[PDB]
Amino acid sequence: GISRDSMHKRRATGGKKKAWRKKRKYELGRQPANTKISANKTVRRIRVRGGNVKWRALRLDTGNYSWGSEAVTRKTRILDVVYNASNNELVRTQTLVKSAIVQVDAAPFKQWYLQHYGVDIKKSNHVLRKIETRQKDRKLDPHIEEQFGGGRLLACISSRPGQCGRADGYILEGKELEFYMKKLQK
Amino acid sequence: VHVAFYRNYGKTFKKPRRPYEKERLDAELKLVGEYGLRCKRELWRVQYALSRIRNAARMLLTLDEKDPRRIFEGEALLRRMNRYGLLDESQNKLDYVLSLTVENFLERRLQTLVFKTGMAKSIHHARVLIRQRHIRVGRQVVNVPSFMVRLDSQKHIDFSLISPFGGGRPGRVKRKNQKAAAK
Amino acid sequence: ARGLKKHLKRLNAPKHWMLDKLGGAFAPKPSSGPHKSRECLPLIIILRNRLKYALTYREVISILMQRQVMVDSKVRTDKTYPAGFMDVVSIPKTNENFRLLYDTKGRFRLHSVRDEEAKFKLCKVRSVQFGQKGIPYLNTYDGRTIRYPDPLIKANDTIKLDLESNKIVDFIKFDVGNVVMVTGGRNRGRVGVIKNREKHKGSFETVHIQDALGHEFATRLGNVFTLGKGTKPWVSLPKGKGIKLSIIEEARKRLAAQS
RNA sequence: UACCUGGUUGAUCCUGCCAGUAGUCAUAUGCUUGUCUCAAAGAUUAAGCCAUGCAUGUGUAAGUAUGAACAAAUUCAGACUGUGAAACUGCGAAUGGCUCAUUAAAUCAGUUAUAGUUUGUUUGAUGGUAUCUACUACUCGGAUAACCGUAGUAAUUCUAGAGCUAAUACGUGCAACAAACCCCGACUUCUGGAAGGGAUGCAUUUAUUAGAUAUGCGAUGAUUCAUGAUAACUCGACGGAUCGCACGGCCGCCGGCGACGCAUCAUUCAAAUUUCUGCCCUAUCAACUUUCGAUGGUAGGAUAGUGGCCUACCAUGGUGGUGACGGGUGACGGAGAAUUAGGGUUCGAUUCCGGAGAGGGAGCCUGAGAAACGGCUACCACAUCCAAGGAAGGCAGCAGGCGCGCAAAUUACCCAAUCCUGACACGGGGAGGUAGUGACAAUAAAUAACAAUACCGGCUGGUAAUUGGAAUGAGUACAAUCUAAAUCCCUUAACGAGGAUCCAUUGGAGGGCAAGUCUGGUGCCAGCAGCCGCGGUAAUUCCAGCUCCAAUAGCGUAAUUUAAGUUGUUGCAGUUAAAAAGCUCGUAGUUGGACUUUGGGAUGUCCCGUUACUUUGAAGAAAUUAGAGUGCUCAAAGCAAGCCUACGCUCUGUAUACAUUAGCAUGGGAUAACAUUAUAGGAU
RNA sequence: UCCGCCGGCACCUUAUGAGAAAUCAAAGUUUUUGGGUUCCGGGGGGAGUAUGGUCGCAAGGCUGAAACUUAAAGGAAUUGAC
RNA sequence: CCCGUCGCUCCUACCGAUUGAAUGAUCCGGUGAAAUGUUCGGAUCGCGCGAGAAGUCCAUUGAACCUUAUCAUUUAGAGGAAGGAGAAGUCGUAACAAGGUUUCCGUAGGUGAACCUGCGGAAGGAUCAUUG
RNA sequence: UUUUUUUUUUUU
RNA sequence: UAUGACUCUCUUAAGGUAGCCAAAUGCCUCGUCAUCUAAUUAGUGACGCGCAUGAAUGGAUUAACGAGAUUCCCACUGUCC
Ligand SMILES: [K+]
Ligand SMILES: [K+]
Ligand SMILES: [K+]
Ligand SMILES: [K+]
Ligand SMILES: [K+]
Ligand SMILES: [K+]
Ligand SMILES: [K+]
Ligand SMILES: [K+]
Ligand SMILES: [K+]
Ligand SMILES: [K+]
Ligand SMILES: [K+]
Ligand SMILES: [K+]
Ligand SMILES: [K+]
Ligand SMILES: [K+]
Ligand SMILES: [K+]
Ligand SMILES: [K+]
Ligand SMILES: [K+]
Ligand SMILES: [K+]
Ligand SMILES: [K+]
Ligand SMILES: [K+]
Ligand SMILES: [K+]
Ligand SMILES: [K+]
Ligand SMILES: [K+]
Ligand SMILES: [Mg+2]
Ligand SMILES: [Mg+2]
Ligand SMILES: [Mg+2]
Ligand SMILES: [Mg+2]
Ligand SMILES: [Mg+2]
Ligand SMILES: [Mg+2]
Ligand SMILES: [Mg+2]
Ligand SMILES: [Mg+2]
Ligand SMILES: [Mg+2]
Ligand SMILES: [Mg+2]
Ligand SMILES: [Mg+2]
Ligand SMILES: [Mg+2]
Ligand SMILES: [Mg+2]
Numbered sequence A: 001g002i003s004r005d006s007m008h009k010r011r012a013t014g015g016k017k018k019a020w021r022k023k024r025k026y027e028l029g030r031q032p033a034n035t036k037i038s039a040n041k042t043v044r045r046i047r048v049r050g051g052n053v054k055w056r057a058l059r060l061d062t063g064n065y066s067w068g069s070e071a072v073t074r075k076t077r078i079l080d081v082v083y084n085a086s087n088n089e090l091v092r093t094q095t096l097v098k099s100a101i102v103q104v105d106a107a108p109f110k111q112w113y114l115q116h117y118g119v120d121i122k123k124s125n126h127v128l129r130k131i132e133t134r135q136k137d138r139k140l141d142p143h144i145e146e147q148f149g150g151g152r153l154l155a156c157i158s159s160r161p162g163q164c165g166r167a168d169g170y171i172l173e174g175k176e177l178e179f180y181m182k183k184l185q186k
Numbered sequence B: 001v002h003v004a005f006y007r008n009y010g011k012t013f014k015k016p017r018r019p020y021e022k023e024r025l026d027a028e029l030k031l032v033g034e035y036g037l038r039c040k041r042e043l044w045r046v047q048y049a050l051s052r053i054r055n056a057a058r059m060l061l062t063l064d065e066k067d068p069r070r071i072f073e074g075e076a077l078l079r080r081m082n083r084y085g086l087l088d089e090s091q092n093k094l095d096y097v098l099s100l101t102v103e104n105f106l107e108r109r110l111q112t113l114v115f116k117t118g119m120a121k122s123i124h125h126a127r128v129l130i131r132q133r134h135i136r137v138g139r140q141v142v143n144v145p146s147f148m149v150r151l152d153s154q155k156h157i158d159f160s161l162i163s164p165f166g167g168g169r170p171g172r173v174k175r176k177n178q179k180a181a182a183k
Numbered sequence C: 001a002r003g004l005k006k007h008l009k010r011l012n013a014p015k016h017w018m019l020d021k022l023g024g025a026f027a028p029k030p031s032s033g034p035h036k037s038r039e040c041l042p043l044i045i046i047l048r049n050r051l052k053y054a055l056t057y058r059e060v061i062s063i064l065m066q067r068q069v070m071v072d073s074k075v076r077t078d079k080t081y082p083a084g085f086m087d088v089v090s091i092p093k094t095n096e097n098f099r100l101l102y103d104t105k106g107r108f109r110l111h112s113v114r115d116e117e118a119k120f121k122l123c124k125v126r127s128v129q130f131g132q133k134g135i136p137y138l139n140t141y142d143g144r145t146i147r148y149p150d151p152l153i154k155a156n157d158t159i160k161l162d163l164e165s166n167k168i169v170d171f172i173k174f175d176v177g178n179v180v181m182v183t184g185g186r187n188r189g190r191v192g193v194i195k196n197r198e199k200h201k202g203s204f205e206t207v208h209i210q211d212a213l214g215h216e217f218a219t220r221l222g223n224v225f226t227l228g229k230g231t232k233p234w235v236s237l238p239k240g241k242g243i244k245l246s247i248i249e250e251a252r253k254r255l256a257a258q259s
Numbered sequence D: 001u002a003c004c005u006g007g008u009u010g011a012u013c014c015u016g017c018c019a020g021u022a023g024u025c026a027u028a029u030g031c032u033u034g035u036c037u038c039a040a041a042g043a044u045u046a047a048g049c050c051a052u053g054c055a056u057g058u059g060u061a062a063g064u065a066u067g068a069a070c071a072a073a074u075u076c077a078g079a080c081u082g083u084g085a086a087a088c089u090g091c092g093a094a095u096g097g098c099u100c101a102u103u104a105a106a107u108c109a110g111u112u113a114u115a116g117u118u119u120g121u122u123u124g125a126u127g128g129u130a131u132c133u134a135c136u137a138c139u140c141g142g143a144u145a146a147c148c149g150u151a152g153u154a155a156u157u158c159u160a161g162a163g164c165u166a167a168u169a170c171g172u173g174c175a176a177c178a179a180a181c182c183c184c185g186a187c188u189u190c191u192g193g194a195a196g197g198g199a200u201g202c203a204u205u206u207a208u209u210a211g212a213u214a215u216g217c218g219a220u221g222a223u224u225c226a227u228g229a230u231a232a233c234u235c236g237a238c239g240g241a242u243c244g245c246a247c248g249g250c251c252g253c254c255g256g257c258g259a260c261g262c263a264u265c266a267u268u269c270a271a272a273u274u275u276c277u278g279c280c281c282u283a284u285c286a287a288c289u290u291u292c293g294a295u296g297g298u299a300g301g302a303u304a305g306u307g308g309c310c311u312a313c314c315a316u317g318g319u320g321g322u323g324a325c326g327g328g329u330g331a332c333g334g335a336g337a338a339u340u341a342g343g344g345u346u347c348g349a350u351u352c353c354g355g356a357g358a359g360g361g362a363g364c365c366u367g368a369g370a371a372a373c374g375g376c377u378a379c380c381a382c383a384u385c386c387a388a389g390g391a392a393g394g395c396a397g398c399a400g401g402c403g404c405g406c407a408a409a410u411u412a413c414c415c416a417a418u419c420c421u422g423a424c425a426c427g428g429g430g431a432g433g434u435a436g437u438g439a440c441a442a443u444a445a446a447u448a449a450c451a452a453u454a455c456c457g458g459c460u461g462g463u464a465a466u467u468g469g470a471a472u473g474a475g476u477a478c479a480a481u482c483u484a485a486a487u488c489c490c491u492u493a494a495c496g497a498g499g500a501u502c503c504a505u506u507g508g509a510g511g512g513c514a515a516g517u518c519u520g521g522u523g524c525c526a527g528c529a530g531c532c533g534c535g536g537u538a539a540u541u542c543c544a545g546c547u548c549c550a551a552u553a554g555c556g557u558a559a560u561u562u563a564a565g566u567u568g569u570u571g572c573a574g575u576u577a578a579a580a581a582g583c584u585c586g587u588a589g590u591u592g593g594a595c596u597u598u599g600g601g602a603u604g605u606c607c608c609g610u611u612a613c614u615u616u617g618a619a620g621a622a623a624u625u626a627g628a629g630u631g632c633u634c635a636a637a638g639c640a641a642g643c644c645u646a647c648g649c650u651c652u653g654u655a656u657a658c659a660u661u662a663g664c665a666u667g668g669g670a671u672a673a674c675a676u677u678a679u680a681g682g683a684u
Numbered sequence E: 001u002c003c004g005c006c007g008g009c010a011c012c013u014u015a016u017g018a019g020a021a022a023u024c025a026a027a028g029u030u031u032u033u034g035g036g037u038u039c040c041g042g043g044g045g046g047a048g049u050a051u052g053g054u055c056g057c058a059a060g061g062c063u064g065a066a067a068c069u070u071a072a073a074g075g076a077a078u079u080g081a082c
Numbered sequence F: 001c002c003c004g005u006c007g008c009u010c011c012u013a014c015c016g017a018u019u020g021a022a023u024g025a026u027c028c029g030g031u032g033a034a035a036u037g038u039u040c041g042g043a044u045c046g047c048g049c050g051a052g053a054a055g056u057c058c059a060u061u062g063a064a065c066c067u068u069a070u071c072a073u074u075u076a077g078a079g080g081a082a083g084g085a086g087a088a089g090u091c092g093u094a095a096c097a098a099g100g101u102u103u104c105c106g107u108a109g110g111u112g113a114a115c116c117u118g119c120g121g122a123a124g125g126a127u128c129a130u131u132g
Numbered sequence G: 001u002u003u004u005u006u007u008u009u010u011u012u
Numbered sequence H: 001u002a003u004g005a006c007u008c009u010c011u012u013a014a015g016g017u018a019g020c021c022a023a024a025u026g027c028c029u030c031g032u033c034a035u036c037u038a039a040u041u042a043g044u045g046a047c048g049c050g051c052a053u054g055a056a057u058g059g060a061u062u063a064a065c066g067a068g069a070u071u072c073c074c075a076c077u078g079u080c081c
């Protein structure tokens, strides 16, 4: 099968290497997951060296995404893939790979913002006092505000769907968000 | 793997470099006849042993006197020679080892000692006795003429207790003759 | 090979076991345990070759299966159980207690010990680190793991372990002026007092040890075992007190005994 | 352990080789072969092909018994508690054994790293939130083997239905009960605290945060490392519905010693990859690698993990006369073997270590571990059976057979020793051992000894198929001993020697080189002769007889070392013996002048940039080699063993040395190598 | 014409040197073996041949084997014979 | 003492039509079993769901075969032409003396054969010598 | 300075 | 054995040298051998007392060229079955 050995390669001098042994099971490789976005979630179980377990995501719909500035992690939906540095065809195919740029639903983060800061982007006296105290340091990125206006947030996938079976990530912020917005505005 | 393969063995003699030296042949024949040896192989084996000992002594003498290796090995070699009677007490230096001849080793053979102490009328008679089991060193019967007798064991040489010359139970020839004469 | 090897050739067996060249085609392969294969003395060797209680492999197995041999106060029924340095081997039926200690020639010796000296042992600490939940612990070179150790204890130190309670009762810090015993290399089995330590960044540390007779020898840090605080070992040493005698004086002593 | 001799000439001195002499744990062959102890043995040509048999199975009190299996008990009651075949379940079969085909910085040796990963098992520690409104936990559910009965097929541990019944098999499920932390939070005497709710075991994934150290806070040379906290996430093979012994204290509740099982860390047994240096011949191989990965970068996929290992984009890099690339090897590498002044030369298939393979490739399941082949799948080459429809293959495992060749053994016995393995003190082991064949090789060692008589030479010696009695093992055999059982050895009743027929052989007799100008035959014939030469009718040389010489149970004959200072670095030659390019230039390479701190006073001590190299230390498998000790009867060997018979002792011994280059650490600063100097942009 | 120095083509004598000698004042300072450096020989033939490569218009040049065969070939010098 | 052509026997290699042949490894393109992943598919089995065989789609590893070419090791071949060895072959006399034309090197041409001749060169010459 | 070719194998 | 390096001779001055060949040149002849084919009076290579080859009545070779004569192979096809 797929092999990770260096026997088939050329020497650094450019010379050819002559085979002296067959392929070994301990240097094998396996086919890519090619995870995609679909409502029909599908994760396969792989038995790997030592009896350990790997998860191959063939199709994923939701992911655990983190807002770093507010330090809030929520499970949201992955809407689509917008940018992929490695290969452009992956954006067309909606492939889910690590470091890919995707759009995620902003509903959970909007709900958390409303519940925490009491702002939309009965109540008891202690609750309004807490919200007022939190309001002093309420600073929000205007770009993130515009993104919330549309209900979708740009995020980077920081996990490996083909290894862990989960498309988790973090919402773009600051200079990284500006860089990716500039690259996408074309 | 065969465990027997790990047992080691070695040669004990070498052939002469020049097969047909007349003087060498004469000297070897003289020694062989004097000491009742069956062939030149025994003399060559004794020469090989003497050469090994002399080479060891020479190698030790090359070293510095205060060398611990020289001291240890020279003491061991001198003790071995004193035990086997090659060197006397006065000969307490490694230099006297180099002055050892094949005759010195041949004189320590059980055959030569048996002939010398008077248990045999001749060297050949002694050889026949030892190979016929009429001689014992201590309480052990020895039938190897090449047996090297140590100084301590030299005085214990005696006729075998189960032999006609050392005890009773005469030989089969004597018993047959007695039976024949009984009639 | 496609996996772990289960056989050990007699020639490949470690030299300090002192196995006959023609004894057989195999030697007892040490089992997994507290001590490494090359630095252990199997119970089969102890019972058959050394103590001669068992005349064969089968007799060794029969003796061990009766639960008559205890290692570190625990009954062991494994013939190839690796018993190494500082280990205590106790046979209650014969009322016999031994400690495994390297002799001046670098070979394991079953040094007879008293009932009071058989209730503890010495271990060398490898490292101290935090486990799960932040619980501190240290591991010794004999495969032991102790939780909540004394904060002063650190790597390369020695700990006195009471076996009955399985607890640390004292410890010796690795420092100059402590009597130590060499557990590896050509100087294995020698006993002396540390003179100095040379530390090289990203390289093995060197330790200089002076023998009771003034002889000096250097070794690596991993080959040094501390036996006590100052110059008095915490345990009784075997015959010779870890003093290596030159071949010349050994021969002199042998001749004197002969005469 | 520093060695030469014959051969060119009428004769001489040389160069130079041929021949001889000795060695091989070196193969084969010829002849001969009485005893004891050791011991290689289808590698060389064919990693060529294989009939037949065996080489991997496995049971403890402690997973599962209703055999319609045996045995003892029960006269009345009994779920079972004695053996247990069979079968399910679990484990193992990835070890061992065989071989050297492929492979030339590759394997491999020494020396590094994983802060770049996996690791059944053993050893030491560590396991706290599941149902939350269903609601068995005094214990959940559905099958299946063995068993039985309907069979199909020529046929296979080929195969379909039907009837039962178990689990430490499968699938579920309460999972003894808490505290603490965080978030939301009605309500509220409101900078507060507050009911209630959510989250909260361990594991995975992603983020935030702490993890200091010129009144608490771990480790390394070095890590946002170990570890803690928070927010969430996962449709989590985790968090015991298991088994054996016993039988007890409170008032049904508690209670011991174990077996097996799941999860985390550490440890052990290991693997994988990896740093530096190191390999034979060849230039009649000088450029090679880069479409289609070559060198590197960015981002991903895959992997147990690093890495062009692979994908997309980007850049043009990477190696090379300090020999790349290509080719040859009758090339697996090393530990080592042969020979030894020193330096060296040759060999290394083979029992130890590492690698690779199971007719040639490729793919893969199971499993902790395999790209496994006494596992499977496909192609290719061979190839067995068939009822012609199908079905089964892998001896470079132990024997054995064909073939091949100069060239290599029994289709035996056993787990008694060493050790391995399984559920396991017990089974199994063609691993391993015993025995058979065995002049590979090695050790010891018979074939005669002594007197009388007769001859000889000076009481002293030699000869005699003359005489005389003594001794003994080769053989033979009770017996014992040995042995897993046998056999052999050792011991030993009764036999066993005069031409002691119990009969020693292999090569030679001109020189090298020890030994006949003997006798007969042949007559440049036949033949001998390693070389020089013998034989032409008086042959020390051929064919024979006698005699003699060398070795001796061995000797002769047909790659490699020495001799060889005839491969020369130590250490050869080049005028005429073979030899210096017709001449000059010249890059790589090699080499390269002198010069920089000496001395006294005293007493190791006080006074006026990078390397080579050398000293010392650590570490550097065994076996082999050297070597200490030791009466296996001696010896090659072996690691034994010794006193005295003490119901024991010697803590019995089972040392020590050697080990190129390369790597690490340390003292020295002579001799050398590279870099630098002054446009001061210099030091302070 | 005479006396000197440096460089050069050579010559004569001599051995305390070397060499198998012939001879050599460099063919010396070499078993008392080592100043630096290039080329090149390994008994005599086959053979400077075959093959490959390369240069040349050609003639041929450069590089350059093996199979096989053989006990001598060869150098200096001595005596005789011619 | 000695050279070569020519004559006979034997041995070893060399050249060679045959767009020669065989084997092994790489190169170009093509076909391509089996397995794995993916899509579809749903015989059938349990409680509208869960599991799921045959089969099918596209990809990955990729045996095996065909085409092209290059290396490496072997090997057949009508015939041609070299070298060597072998007691008493033929024709001359080329080399050894000034060998009877001194010998030899390079080059070119020509003769049965050794060899002859032309140009330049060497003494290894048969001259170390004419201040005559 | 006209011309002058040849001498079977081994051995002494 | 065969031939004839060598010597001498006749017609008629010489006596086919270097080369080449069953040739667009050979009767015998569809010559002999090898190769190509299942099979070849064809083709190619080789041999040569060659009826009757041969040197500017020019001999031998030759890249490139040819609506020139010949043989074979691949592709192609109603030439043919
Ligand atoms: K062998
Ligand atoms: K089973
Ligand atoms: K297994
Ligand atoms: K290595
Ligand atoms: K700290
Ligand atoms: K190597
Ligand atoms: K990787
Ligand atoms: K990369
Ligand atoms: K290899
Ligand atoms: K397993
Ligand atoms: K076999
Ligand atoms: K056994
Ligand atoms: K001779
Ligand atoms: K006659
Ligand atoms: K005669
Ligand atoms: K002779
Ligand atoms: K001439
Ligand atoms: K001449
Ligand atoms: K002529
Ligand atoms: K003759
Ligand atoms: K005419
Ligand atoms: K012309
Ligand atoms: K035309
Ligand atoms: Mg193995
Ligand atoms: Mg020598
Ligand atoms: Mg002569
Ligand atoms: Mg081979
Ligand atoms: Mg390397
Ligand atoms: Mg583990
Ligand atoms: Mg961390
Ligand atoms: Mg990467
Ligand atoms: Mg090979
Ligand atoms: Mg080998
Ligand atoms: Mg073998
Ligand atoms: Mg091996
Ligand atoms: Mg394999």
Ligand SMILES: [Mg+2]
Binding pocket: D359
């Ligand atoms: Mg085979």
Ligand SMILES: [Mg+2]
Binding pocket: none
């Ligand atoms: Mg196969």
Ligand SMILES: [Mg+2]
Binding pocket: D373
């Ligand atoms: Mg396989």
Ligand SMILES: [Mg+2]
Binding pocket: none
């Ligand atoms: Mg196998």
Ligand SMILES: [Mg+2]
Binding pocket: D374, D395
């Ligand atoms: Mg097999």
Ligand SMILES: [Mg+2]
Binding pocket: D408
């Ligand atoms: Mg043989």
Ligand SMILES: [Mg+2]
Binding pocket: none
């Ligand atoms: Mg022998």
Ligand SMILES: [Mg+2]
Binding pocket: D447
């Ligand atoms: Mg006899």
Ligand SMILES: [Mg+2]
Binding pocket: D514
């Ligand atoms: Mg003689």
Ligand SMILES: [Mg+2]
Binding pocket: D539
């Ligand atoms: Mg005669």
Ligand SMILES: [Mg+2]
Binding pocket: none
């Ligand atoms: Mg004769």
Ligand SMILES: [Mg+2]
Binding pocket: D566, D572
């Ligand atoms: Mg020479």
Ligand SMILES: [Mg+2]
Binding pocket: none
């Ligand atoms: Mg000459």
Ligand SMILES: [Mg+2]
Binding pocket: none
């Ligand atoms: Mg010459």
Ligand SMILES: [Mg+2]
Binding pocket: none
């Ligand atoms: Mg010249």
Ligand SMILES: [Mg+2]
Binding pocket: none
């Ligand atoms: Mg040149």
